[PDB]
Amino acid sequence: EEHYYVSIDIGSSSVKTIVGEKFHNGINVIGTGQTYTSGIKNGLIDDFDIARQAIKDTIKKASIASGVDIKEVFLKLPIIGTEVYDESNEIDFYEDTEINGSHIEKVLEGIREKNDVQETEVINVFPIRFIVDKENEVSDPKELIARHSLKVEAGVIAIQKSILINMIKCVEACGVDVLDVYSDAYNYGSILTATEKELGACVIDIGEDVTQVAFYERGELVDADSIEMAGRDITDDIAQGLNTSYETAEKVKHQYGHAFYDSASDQDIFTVEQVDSDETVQYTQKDLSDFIEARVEEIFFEVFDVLQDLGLTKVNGGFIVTGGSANLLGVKELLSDMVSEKVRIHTPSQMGIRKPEFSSAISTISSSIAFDELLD
Ligand SMILES: Nc1ncnc2c1ncn2[C@@H]1O[C@H](COP(=O)(O)OP(=O)(O)OP(=O)(O)O)[C@@H](O)[C@H]1O
Ligand SMILES: [Mg+2]
């Protein structure tokens, strides 16, 4: 009777898998898997076989770590080729009907059916509110008696069919079933406080190839997008600036990386190899932070451009930065120097996943739980 929730994040840098348990009104992580791969680029499958093997290896790792024979999983989908919009649907009753999870599922399904865009598929439909018998608004209609109808006013996330199909295919080629998919646009709602989600908060996830942006207000997702600029570009800038290899630039980024120049130490020194020579050059943390700060600043300017385009300039709920690149020192200080609102770095609380790169994978689990609770 043991119930586990397994999520998979097919990242450009690494595939991440989490095995979760419902505990103390939250999630207990009993196992994780992580595999760095080259099969994924810009959040999409670049080499099917390599990606497939990476996913398989990650599922194996999580299975060994948790002691669970993983057969069914929940898959996150990146905010790429994605559209967010509002839609309503209503189902009719011709006799007094006690509402249950099946009616909710039906009325939500109708919204999936309403989409007639051939290239895209609706992946998530989440209720904003319910209306019983055209007049009575409710948060949760279950166990209420409807005499005429049940309407839902919902948020909808649709994605390019090619992405959905390919990701699911790649995962299911590893001997597991994909139970459901969850867009990160929906997922990131879980890392926010009720206050943040109410006032108007912006989530910025800086990964390797992709930076994702999602805005929430009045307790619901408003809109989302992604930018093709993240950690890899920071590394590129380091490699170019220090005239070193990409590999060395990556290691240097982890070891001495700092995103705020004024706070970076010129007394903290390190040595680096050269590409066009056999000689070695010494650099300081401040020298490095010059390039790192320039790139991260550019990323945040891209984020501001997205917010301006979406008409979401007012961010009273503040900024919440996550993802692997949020591991960099000085990120919070830089963004705080760029905005008048509150800024924080989100890191999952559970032991084993206290790294910001896991934010998506854990959130996915929450998402699934939420729907489980909704369709009761
Ligand atoms: N301690 C650290 N300091 C600086 N950067 C780091 C650190 N740890 C990881 N990173 C960077 O984070 C990035 C990977 O983050 P993450 O795992 O969130 O990306 P992903 O989800 O695999 O890729 P994407 O979301 O872009 O498809 C890499 O660019 C890596 O260099
Ligand atoms: Mg990611």
Swiss-Prot record:
Main localization of the protein described in the UniProt heading: membrane
Protein origin, superkingdom: Bacteria
Membrane topology: Peripheral membrane protein
Localization terms from the record: Cell membrane
Spans traversing the lipid bilayer: none
Keywords: Cell cycle, Cell division, Cell membrane, Membrane
Free-text function comment from the UniProt entry: Cell division protein that is involved in the assembly of the Z ring. May serve as a membrane anchor for the Z ring.
Family designation: Belongs to the FtsA/MreB family.
Name the UniProt record assigns to this protein: Cell division protein FtsA
Species the sequence originates in: Staphylococcus aureus (strain MW2)
Full-protein interval shown: 2 to 377 of 470
